[PDB]
Amino acid sequence: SRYKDNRPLNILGIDISKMELGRYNLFEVSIFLQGSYLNPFDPQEIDVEGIFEDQYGNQYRVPGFFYQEYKRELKNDYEYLVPVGDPYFKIRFSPINIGSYKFFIKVKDKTGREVSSDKYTIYVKESEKPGYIRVSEKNWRYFKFDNGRQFLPIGANICWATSKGTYDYDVWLPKCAENGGNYFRVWLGPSWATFALERESVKEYDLKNAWKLDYVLNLAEKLNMYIMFCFDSYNELRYQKEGAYPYWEHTPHYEKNGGPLKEPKDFWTNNEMIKYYKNKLRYIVARYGYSTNVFAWEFWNEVDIISPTAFVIGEVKKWHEDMAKYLNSIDPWKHLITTSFAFSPGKPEIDSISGLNFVQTHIYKSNRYIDALLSLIAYKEKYRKPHLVGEFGLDAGGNDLWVDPNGYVIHNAIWTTILSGASGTAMSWWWDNHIHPNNLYFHYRALADFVKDINFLEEKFERLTNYKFNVYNREIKVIGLQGKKYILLWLYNAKEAYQYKKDIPNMDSSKFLGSIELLIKPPIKVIYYDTYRGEKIKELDLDKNVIPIIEFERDLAIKIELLG
């Protein structure tokens, strides 16, 4: 309770960021107040709210949150944050409709006293922003923005920084975005994470780390990138004796460290922990919910590998059901909600929860991972909601960095996942020690440029099924999608695709190798696409349904337009 107050409840002053702003832009109110509370992060101690109403009958009840300003510097080789001024409270709002809004501020503290402001009027004009990300109503395999444009996530995990903190995101994110990236994932736990809110306590949240997350969210806003926020990771609830980077002994949840829990099993049902967790969800909604650059709220990283002493399937299921209902109810903008598993097929009792809007896969597999991805994507179509391969690599142990410096594994996975029908790319690990130093972003640029003009929401793509290969003395395989106006093929050499010691293909020749016959109606236009240089190699107008395959080293993309 370092931030306690014991004065009669009064609003002292307010600052309004701007009285006119654009659709989906941030409207920020800053509030100085005094009152009686032991913990500004607990709504039973102090409850700040903004009540906003448009001219179309919609009301928004926006929780407010405690804030400390900082000034950042790169002091030697680490980020250093200097506090500026006293902490105070904020309300962060984003308008969905344009036009006029009225709003007022309401505050209640532990004494039961309530105070309110007068009503203020603001004006919202049209903007370029596409809105929040939702599941597509036209094709449940994919995401959309509110404005109807597709959101096809292309990117990687970028879940924490080095000691350089936000200065690492200053480097990684512009490089990702200039190479077709629009997506990343960050971690808000365990307590060592860059953006850890529960750093020293589960009752009070870390204002420095929350400020870093502000900064990175603002950078995503400037770069048109969209972020999955992962609230907790399994390490928090895994005992030392169980390995796999366990952190229970160090986590603030444990009674040894000041928390309410005697053991991780009690996380799911302890009333005090549930209350604190709901307070955390309220803080996250208050501080970040306004942002259309929040793609999704993710409760857990790999909740199935918490301690086996703590995983009770019915309790974990009920907790996800109840927390998804609570989060949705307090989030004025109704962001997407998900969770994840280490077990690649996931847990159907949890994945089928209606309140989880999409499902995920994590998979680290060294052999025949192309087939594994295809199989998992086919399997999870049973849920009739989008599927994000949210973690991918060869080996949780990092063998990738030594065996595949050119990123062929990432390359194979991102092409496989997009052309197998998943909602976006397989999302690599190793952002800091592999993707960036090896400059692997070109793989994403080539894929992004291949799919950029295809509307997955309209094509009614199905996996390619009726094809005949005529290829002699080479074992070529195909992953493909057949749609209303396009067929998209990724062809790979089953031998070479899993061999990583070779230099990046430099395609010079374009000899004839073989053919693929497809069930289509001429005429058609065939585009051959170099998946490494990210460019068209050759274009062929065809009057029959036999598509030549030109020579390639490792893999080749083909885009076929149904003209007839």
TrEMBL record:
One of its GO terms (molecular function) is mannan endo-1,4-beta-mannosidase activity. Coiled coil: none annotated. One of its GO terms (cellular component) is extracellular region. Transmembrane segments: none annotated. InterPro entries: GH, Ig-like_fold, MAN-like. This is DUF5060 domain-containing protein. It comes from Dictyoglomus thermophilum.
